[PDB]
Amino acid sequence: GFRPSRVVVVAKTTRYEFEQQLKGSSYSGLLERHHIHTKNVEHIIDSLRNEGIEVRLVKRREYDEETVRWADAVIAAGGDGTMLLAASKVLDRLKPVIGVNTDPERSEGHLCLPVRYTHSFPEALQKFYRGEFRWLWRQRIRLYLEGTGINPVPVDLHEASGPQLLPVRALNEVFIGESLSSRASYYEISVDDGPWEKQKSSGLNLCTGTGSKAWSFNINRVATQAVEDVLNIAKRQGNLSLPLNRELVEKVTNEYNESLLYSPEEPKILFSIREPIANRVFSSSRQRCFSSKVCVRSRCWDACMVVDGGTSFEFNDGAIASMMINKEDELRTVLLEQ
Amino acid sequence: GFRPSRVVVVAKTTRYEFEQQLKGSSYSGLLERHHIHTKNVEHIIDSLRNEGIEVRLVKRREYDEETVRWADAVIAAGGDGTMLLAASKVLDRLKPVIGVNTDPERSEGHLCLPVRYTHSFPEALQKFYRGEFRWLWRQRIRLYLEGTGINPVPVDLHEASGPQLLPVRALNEVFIGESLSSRASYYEISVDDGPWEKQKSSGLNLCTGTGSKAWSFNINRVATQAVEDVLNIAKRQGNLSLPLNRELVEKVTNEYNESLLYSPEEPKILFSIREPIANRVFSSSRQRCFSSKVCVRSRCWDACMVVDGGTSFEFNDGAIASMMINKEDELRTVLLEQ
Ligand SMILES: NC(=O)c1ccc[n+]([C@@H]2O[C@H](COP(=O)([O-])OP(=O)(O)OC[C@H]3O[C@@H](n4cnc5c(N)ncnc54)[C@H](OP(=O)(O)O)[C@@H]3O)[C@@H](O)[C@H]2O)c1
Ligand SMILES: NC(=O)c1ccc[n+]([C@@H]2O[C@H](COP(=O)([O-])OP(=O)(O)OC[C@H]3O[C@@H](n4cnc5c(N)ncnc54)[C@H](OP(=O)(O)O)[C@@H]3O)[C@@H](O)[C@H]2O)c1
Numbered sequence: 001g002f003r004p005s006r007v008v009v010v011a012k013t014t015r016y017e018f019e020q021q022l023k024g025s026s027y028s029g030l031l032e033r034h035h036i037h038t039k040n041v042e043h044i045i046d047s048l049r050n051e052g053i054e055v056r057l058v059k060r061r062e063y064d065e066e067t068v069r070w071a072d073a074v075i076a077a078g079g080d081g082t083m084l085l086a087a088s089k090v091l092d093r094l095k096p097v098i099g100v101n102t103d104p105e106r107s108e109g110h111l112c113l114p115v116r117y118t119h120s121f122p123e124a125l126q127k128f129y130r131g132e133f134r135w136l137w138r139q140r141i142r143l144y145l146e147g148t149g150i151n152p153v154p155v156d157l158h159e160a161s162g163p164q165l166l167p168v169r170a171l172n173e174v175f176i177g178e179s180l181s182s183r184a185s186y187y188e189i190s191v192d193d194g195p196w197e198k199q200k201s202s203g204l205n206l207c208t209g210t211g212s213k214a215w216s217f218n219i220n221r222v223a224t225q226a227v228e229d230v231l232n233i234a235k236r237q238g239n240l241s242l243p244l245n246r247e248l249v250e251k252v253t254n255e256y257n258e259s260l261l262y263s264p265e266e267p268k269i270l271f272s273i274r275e276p277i278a279n280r281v282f283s284s285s286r287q288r289c290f291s292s293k294v295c296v297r298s299r300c301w302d303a304c305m306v307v308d309g310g311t312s313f314e315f316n317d318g319a320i321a322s323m324m325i326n327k328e329d330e331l332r333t334v335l336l337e338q
Numbered sequence: 339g340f341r342p343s344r345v346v347v348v349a350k351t352t353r354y355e356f357e358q359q360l361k362g363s364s365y366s367g368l369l370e371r372h373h374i375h376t377k378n379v380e381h382i383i384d385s386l387r388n389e390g391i392e393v394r395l396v397k398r399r400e401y402d403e404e405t406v407r408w409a410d411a412v413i414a415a416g417g418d419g420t421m422l423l424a425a426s427k428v429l430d431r432l433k434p435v436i437g438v439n440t441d442p443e444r445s446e447g448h449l450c451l452p453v454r455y456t457h458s459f460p461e462a463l464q465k466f467y468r469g470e471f472r473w474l475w476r477q478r479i480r481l482y483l484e485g486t487g488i489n490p491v492p493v494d495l496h497e498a499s500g501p502q503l504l505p506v507r508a509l510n511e512v513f514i515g516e517s518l519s520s521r522a523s524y525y526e527i528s529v530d531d532g533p534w535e536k537q538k539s540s541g542l543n544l545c546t547g548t549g550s551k552a553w554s555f556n557i558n559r560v561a562t563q564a565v566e567d568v569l570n571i572a573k574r575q576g577n578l579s580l581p582l583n584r585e586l587v588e589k590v591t592n593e594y595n596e597s598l599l600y601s602p603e604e605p606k607i608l609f610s611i612r613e614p615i616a617n618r619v620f621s622s623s624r625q626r627c628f629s630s631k632v633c634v635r636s637r638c639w640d641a642c643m644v645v646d647g648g649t650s651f652e653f654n655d656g657a658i659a660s661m662m663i664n665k666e667d668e669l670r671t672v673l674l675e676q
């Protein structure tokens with residue numbers, strides 16, 4: 001069983017708090033969105049204090065490493081974005097990090113406790129107390145940086161030198177690309193210490209098993225129409241039998257897309273070349289594959305390495321990044337029944 | 339036949355000229371890249387003057403509408419990027435625009451004359467003179483902007499109000515998305531005056547037939563591995579017969595990908611939702627389809643409408659853009675044998 005005496009709760013900033021800091025696309029829904037989150041944060045904190053747990057409630061600007069150190073456990077109160085924020089400042093594989101979905105009608109909360117615990121949190125505490133749960137260590141990617149002209153200083157997106165460790169780990173993915181959305185990205189890639197291979201594309205995505213359902217899923221999943229087309233082509237071009245139906249096309253589609261998801265516990269990186277350009281002057285290889293190690297040498301003008309959509313690093317011509325998975329970067333999370 | 343007496347040649351700026359305005363990723367190749375382009379520009383201009391044609395050679399900063407007006411024809415001397423630059427300032431469907439690939443080992447030049455004419459330009463002039471060619475009018479998209487808080491002023495990326503016409507046409511595509519590469523984009527889309535539909539994704543691409551081979555192709559094409567997987571799934575899940583082989587998988591792949599390309603002359607927009615997010619809180623519809631008309635209402639924080647990778651417009655919450663295809667926006671281009 002597991003009973004912290006000391007807990008920091010990191011709560012997301014709501015849209016309403018943002019504007020506080022009408023037209024027609026806000027206010028009415030926004031204030032109700034704010035009341036729901038606040039009602040649920042209060043339920044979490046009241047429930048913790050009723051178990052005798054000391055609690056510090058902070059917003060993003062006050063969530064710091066000192067407070068993580070003070071705490072026995074971190075609770076992210078918001079959505080998956082709030083889990084990523086919480087994980088960004090936890091580097092100890094023994095420190096539990098737990099997510100509570102505070103607006104389940106608008107937050108997916110895939111990294112969070114099942115939705116029932118949002119308004120039944122004492123039930124979650126008791127399940128923890130009795131050990132009716134399992135530890136889940138989610139693998140994360142660490143980033144090294146070397147080369148010429150490099151700038152290793154992290155930028156917080158929510159407002160010749162040897163390899164040095166960058167101060168965040170990726171729980172979802174590392175995205176590498178030019179800052180301008182229409183500017184093709186140019187680099188060289190070494191996978192598992194293999195040969196260097198020039199790529200031109202709209203960026204690279206390097207995700208964990210946790211991240212396999214996030215950005216990586218939407219880069220790689222095929223539409224049920226595309227599957228329907230591919231199958232119809234296979235009839236014309238060789239009468240590949242079968243009866244294609246509504247049911248079958250969805251099925252085969254779903255089987256393909258599940259192949260893109262893998263276990264959060266497996267220490268492997270799924271890397272995807274995002275929208276590669278082939279034609280007669282460039283040539284690309286595989287679109288995606290698993291690996292333990294990816295090294296990227298920047299050839300970019302004004303590009304960034306973005307960790308979990310939250311922390312950005314400069315990555316221009318001369319910079320060399322290496323990504324791997326290290327056991328000491330595992331993020332300690334919990335699994336409850338729903 | 340077709341014999342201009344007055345011609346403006348727009349020549350790209352080379353990398354060397356850029357730096358002029360070594361390590362290891364430049365110079366050696368860069369100066370040879372520069373000599374090749376310059377040698378070919380001189381051949382073009384010498385050939386024109388030898389036909390008695392008056393010629394003004396300009397770089398991007400001096401390419402203006404006045405000079406287009408002066409000219410009987412525009413020649414873009416570079417790659418497809420130089421064709422797009424040239425087309426950006428031509429709004430008259432009667433003014434010929436012709437592209438010459440000045441570095442065919444590094445420029446694809448899909449919008450340009452066949453590579454042989456790069457060093458055999460008098461042959462192209464004579465073919466023009468004798469009418470051994472066909473006019474190709476490439477359809478282009480025009481952009482209207484309305485709404486609240488809008489800013490219709492174009493930004494040149496290479497350094498309550500009613501609908502107003504934006505001053506460029508898209509020869510390849512209009513891209514719409516948030517400026518930050520990791521920030522999901524949010525908007526509502528009306529296709530052919532249909533119902534408004536909320537989307538969340540990494541942007542929208544709205545291309546012409548000319549643009550169908552560019553960005554749109556790499557957003558939508560499927561990998562030969564994915565086809566191989568989809569086919570193998572169809573065996574397991576219903577023994578859909580056939581013998582899958584190296585040959586067959588490439589074939590079916592190629593048939594699918596050709597379905598993404600359409601004629602530059604056809605007045606239809608192929609629009610693609612780029613990396614839509616579905617899950618349990620959002621829901622998307624079709625990934626791509628043809629249309630005559632797409633209206634997009636921005637819900638974005640800090641987004642842009644990017645025309646042919648060269649001209650950018652602000653497009654944040656309150657802005658409403660409508661895209662269509664108008665005959666007076668056709669771009670007059672030529673077709674030569676190779
Ligand atoms: N086109 C795309 O798919 C795209 C574009 C940009 C970013 N992203 C992803 O969004 C992450 C940043 O999340 P954010 O909440 O700060 O911004 P966000 O725009 O709210 O994220 C988009 C959605 O993905 C969900 N999500 C986040 N991490 C996930 C995971 N590991 N597995 C499954 N779903 C997940 C989020 O859930 P909640 O509703 O609980 O927030 C959200 O509904 C990034 O690391 C990136 O992976 C995806
Ligand atoms: N991931 C992607 O596929 C991606 C990302 C950004 C932009 N783009 C495309 O590139 C366009 C801007 O071109 P750029 O030359 O200024 O930058 P660029 O990075 O040099 O364009 C990428 C390549 O596409 C080729 N291309 C351009 N227009 C084409 C067309 N209509 N059909 C077939 N190929 C075409 C270019 O040919 P050249 O070698 O002759 O220049 C170039 O090789 C944009 O409108 C957009 O469509 C694609």
Ligand SMILES: [Ca+2]
Pocket residue numbers: 079080081082
């Ligand atoms: Ca979120």
Ligand SMILES: [Ca+2]
Pocket residue numbers: 417418419420
């Ligand atoms: Ca180019």
